[PDB]
């Protein structure tokens, strides 16, 4: 009893809202829901993302894709000049670190001997 | 051809034991795995990886209205760094803003995306 229920949304600061809208809505195929003065809201991978215009290495957000889609995503990111760093590692136009994976994190947990599993 | 779901989020932290206490004891997540400089948790259905390493972003979780006071008191009782929100965010049981031991800003909210959309009803797509 008493648990946080779910993720509610993520918020990212961005230098240029138009560049970020083409990245999230066209290259990553998220749904644009609303725009305002210096803001945009998307639904992407079931997650509300809020971008805030204000004209780094200590966090990343990873997303799951169908493994049969891996070549489609790698080619899509490559052919849209995305900064690329089975798994794909990349950034958005501001440098926020993102990743695509074709397996759950739990399935990696099953992969890993001197670690301690709970 | 759509991304399916969130896989996990990762944060770098200065002190793994202090972050385990924050995400697992205070926020009631579950510790799933540790390695020399690493810990993984499940929190609110989300997998969180922490990497020990000796603003531009925030992450928000949903809580029920009926649990707002429980959470606000729990964070205060644990000396968590609480940040100011809008006027009436506390009294109207809307939002709590705070940070983890490293400064990563987090939020608890009782309202969803549809509630925010209805509320704003800016350009609506």
From Swiss-Prot, chain B:
Pfam families: Glyoxalase
UniProt GO MF annotations: magnesium ion binding; transferase activity, transferring alkyl or aryl (other than methyl) groups
InterPro entries recorded: Fosfomycin_Res_Enzymes, Glyas_Bleomycin-R_OHBP_Dase, Glyas_Fos-R_dOase_dom, Metallothiol_Trafse_FosB, VOC
Gene Ontology CC annotations of this record: cytoplasm
Sequence ranges assigned to domain VOC in this UniProt record: 5-111
Source superkingdom: Bacteria
Keywords on record: Antibiotic resistance, Cytoplasm, Magnesium, Metal-binding, Transferase
Record field: transmembrane: none
Keyword Repeat assigned: no
Active site: 107
Subunit-structure text: Homodimer.
Name recorded for this polypeptide: Metallothiol transferase FosB
The species this protein was found in: Staphylococcus aureus (strain N315)
């Amino acid at each position: 009893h008493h648990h946080l229920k779910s993720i509610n949304h993520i918020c990212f600061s961005v230098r240029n809202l138009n560049d970020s809208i083409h990245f999230y809505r066209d290259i990553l195929l998220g749904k644009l829901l609303l725009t305002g003065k210096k803001t945009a809201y998307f639904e992407l991978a079931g997650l509300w993302i809020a971008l805030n215009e204000e004209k780094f290495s200590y966090t990343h957000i990873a997303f799951t894709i169908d493994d049969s889609e891996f070549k489609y995503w790698h080619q899509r990111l490559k052919d849209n000049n995305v900064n690329i760093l089975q798994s794909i590692y990349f950034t958005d136009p501001d440098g926020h670190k993102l990743e695509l994976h074709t397996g759950t994190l739990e399935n990696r947990l099953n992969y890993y001997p001197h670690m301690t599993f709970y």
